[PDB]
Design a binder for this molecule. Structure first.
Ligand SMILES: *[C@@H]1O[C@H](CO)[C@@H](O[C@@H]2O[C@H](CO)[C@@H](O[C@@H]3O[C@H](CO[C@H]4O[C@H](CO)[C@@H](O)[C@H](O[C@H]5O[C@H](CO)[C@@H](O)[C@H](O)[C@@H]5O)[C@@H]4O)[C@@H](O)[C@H](O[C@H]4O[C@H](CO)[C@@H](O)[C@H](O)[C@@H]4O[C@H]4O[C@H](CO)[C@@H](O)[C@H](O)[C@@H]4O)[C@@H]3O)[C@H](O)[C@H]2NC(C)=O)[C@H](O)[C@H]1NC(C)=O
Ligand SMILES: *[C@@H]1O[C@H](CO)[C@@H](O[C@@H]2O[C@H](CO)[C@@H](O[C@@H]3O[C@H](CO[C@H]4O[C@H](CO)[C@@H](O)[C@H](O[C@H]5O[C@H](CO)[C@@H](O)[C@H](O)[C@@H]5O)[C@@H]4O)[C@@H](O)[C@H](O[C@H]4O[C@H](CO)[C@@H](O)[C@H](O)[C@@H]4O[C@H]4O[C@H](CO)[C@@H](O)[C@H](O)[C@@H]4O)[C@@H]3O)[C@H](O)[C@H]2NC(C)=O)[C@H](O)[C@H]1NC(C)=O
Lengths: 357, 357
């Protein structure tokens, strides 16, 4: 099914949730790739120490083969990550920027009840040069308490990274611009009798005089206004990520002015298309994965079925000789006592290598 | 001098510039540290290839000493970076979040001219149960054109990373909360004659009838209102980063509700205090820096004045034998032709190592 997450965006709060959840998704994709690289670099440091601790030439060349293989695929993956990383980060930054904007607009659009100030009565005056009575209010304000977005269980299940793989996303839904740009209000004026500049009894936040001024235009002459509500209604809009052919991003920049939704759709599309390729996890490498790896053809040719002779006929032998030592083999010396992999990621990593070399 | 940058914050636009410039500063500090690490890791890969290409045992141990030294200081610096990295990123994210908020509020607070709708005349009606005439407006709006922040040459010179070292920052300046929460407006009602529900001539966006209704309350009876301006005035506030003793961060969380300025000051303070330590740049290492390095005592003891015997009596000899080969020594083979440092950061890095090993 397509657009489960975007199709759940029907309010400012759910667009905020979508934008933040997608940004976190992109950020997490990068973090996961970088964690995989760092695990690979830690494995290379571990095999480097094991190579220095070996007495057998062919076992030393075996560790060197893993070092060479590890450096090749990990350096290459790190270089290849950089393009997609920057593309995904551009989208995450914009999505967080949008979510901030919308949250700030939400707080202002919640200010829907006005506080009237005490008015001043007058005669004719700008912008009512033809009036006999005016009632002028300065500094009417509207403020809301602190707003917060509340999400239901299903909000968080549907607007979720689990629904944000590129293969299911075709559109984004956004709140219309007027929610972020426009103040809206209702107001009403009321008059009774002959209000003039003399209508200077202000106890009811209007202009009254004559008779007995009081609540509900008690006086003989009265003029006033009230702002009875404020707040602009949110609307939603859909923006497609791809062109009609489905391959290319819609809303490419440089073709004329664009709306916020179009700039966001373009960034999200490019971030979705910039798939990250994660290399083999060296620390959990199996025998079959190693000898099947294309890079091991030239590496094995350089250092050495020849691969099975060096790394084992079974995966059990390979795990025994080349994988399990990382976590279980203890290294001890003094010039320090730790397991291989932790040691080669510790402050004594380099010193352990120099000691055994 | 202290607080050159914060002391230049006097407007929403200059606070936005400060917040974005400080966030970029923190981000750039991390990028610079990570670039230094990656340069060090590239140097270790280069020395690894040179060690495999050496025939002399003592020259091989010399490269191994640089490899061990490089791994030790760079792994340690990478681990030590993580705390400060996260602290600085927390502040940069919040500063960008604040700048977004303020920019969105700026756009709304620029909507200072109202568009009146056509009113509807009435008699007594809520909230003027005592009036004889009412004039009710629904959907008055205010919208501004797209706002942008314009900075002068000196704005950018003073609000600048060059003025954002921790030693000169004691406070932040922020726009007051009401700019982000409160709608403000002026309004005036005008009356003439005896306006009632019959005052249904709306051509002037007010309620008129009798005589000749027209501009400036031309008719005998008239009632109307205008929203003559909107917009909340920005104010500024100062928040100290440190306690009175000057060492500890003010506005630590967990002690009660906090304002936005206090949360930001705390994050900025911790980001300022979380100084990053960058290790020696291996690719530009000098002889004196190497033998002076404390880590080289145990490393040299493990592998070998003994340091000068291995690395050279002068820096010229050291640069010749251990630094300049990274950029000038060409490596060629086929199983590829490139200089040492570029090769060991290329797709053929691992294969070059395996070939010569
Ligand atoms: C979160 O909310 C905030 C707050 O609202 C949003 O921030 C706003 O973001 C917009 C969009 O980025 C900003 O508008 C941009 O402003 C740029 C600067 O304009 C000023 O300086 C330039 C000189 O550098 C002047 O030329 C401008 O004057 C002209 O424009 C004004 C306004 O229309 C007129 O009144 C003048 O008479 C001049 O005509 C300003 O003084 C500006 O460069 C930028 O322009 C591009 O985009 C607009 C449409 O937005 C096009 O009309 C324009 O032609 C430009 O587009 C061409 O170029 C781009 C590449 O740059 C191509 O990709 C296009 O396809 C096209 O070929 C734009 O106007 C705004 O300033 C900013 N507001 C604040 C307060 O910060 C955030 O966007 C929002 N974020 C998210 C993620 O939601
Ligand atoms: C950019 O602009 C946006 C838009 O304005 C800003 O976003 C706002 O940011 C604030 C601050 O982070 C958000 O407020 C926070 O809301 C949290 C969620 O509250 C709701 O859920 C909880 C349950 O999880 C309920 O308990 C709440 O109900 C209670 O509060 C409301 C409102 O007062 C009352 O009406 C109710 O009756 C309840 O009493 C809400 O329903 C909330 O957890 C969080 O609370 C801490 O901070 C407030 C002060 O802001 C304290 O009063 C409170 O006691 C909490 O503080 C203790 O805990 C913290 C650790 O969490 C300690 O550090 C403190 O020292 C203290 O011991 C806060 O209220 C707001 O929701 C959000 N708005 C939107 C629309 O997103 C951005 O901040 C801004 N960004 C920048 C960088 O400028």
């Amino acid at each position: 099914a397509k657009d489960t997450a975007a199709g759940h965006v029907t309010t400012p709060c759910t667009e905020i949730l979508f934008d933040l959840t997608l940004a976190k998704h992109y950020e997490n994709q990068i973090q996961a790739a970088e964690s995989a690289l760092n695990r690979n670099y830690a494995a290379i440091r571990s095999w480097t120490l094991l190579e220095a601790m070996s007495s057998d030439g062919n076992r030393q060349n075996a560790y060197t083969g893993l070092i060479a293989y590890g450096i090749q695929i990990t350096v290459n993956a790190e270089q290849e990550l950089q393009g997609p990383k920057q593309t995904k980060l551009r989208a995450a930054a914009a999505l967080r920027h949008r979510a901030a904007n919308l949250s700030a607009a939400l707080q202002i659009q919640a200010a829907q009840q006005a506080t009237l100030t005490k008015p001043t009565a007058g005669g004719a005056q700008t912008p009512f040069s033809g009036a006999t009575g005016t009632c002028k209010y300065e500094g009417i304000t509207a403020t809301a308490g602190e707003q917060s977005c509340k999400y239901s269980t299903e909000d968080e299940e549907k607007i979720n990274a689990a629904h944000m793989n590129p293969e299911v996303m075709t559109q984004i839904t956004t709140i219309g611009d007027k929610y972020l740009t426009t103040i809206t209000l209702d107001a009403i004026a009321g008059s009774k009798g002959n209000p003039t500049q003399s209508s200077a009894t202000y106890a009811e936040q209007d202009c009254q005089d004559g008779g007995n001024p009081g609540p509900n235009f008690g006086g003989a002459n009265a003029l006033g206004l009230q702002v009875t509500k404020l707040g602009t209604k949110a609307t939603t809009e859909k923006t497609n990520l791809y062109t009609a052919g489905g391959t290319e991003c819609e809303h490419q920049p440089g073709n004329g002015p664009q709306k916020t939704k179009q700039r966001l759709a373009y960034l999200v599309c490019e971030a979705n298309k910039a798939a990250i390729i994660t290399p083999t996890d060296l620390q959990t490498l199996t025998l079959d994965a190693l000898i099947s790896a294309p890079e091991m053809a030239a590496i094995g040719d350089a250092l050495l079925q020849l691969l099975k002779k060096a790394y084992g006929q079974t995966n059990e032998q390979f795990q025994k000789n080349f994988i399990k030592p990382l976590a279980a083999q203890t290294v001890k010396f003094k010039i320090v006592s730790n397991t291989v992999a932790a040691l080669m990621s510790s402050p004594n990593s380099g010193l352990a290598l120099a000691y055994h070399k």
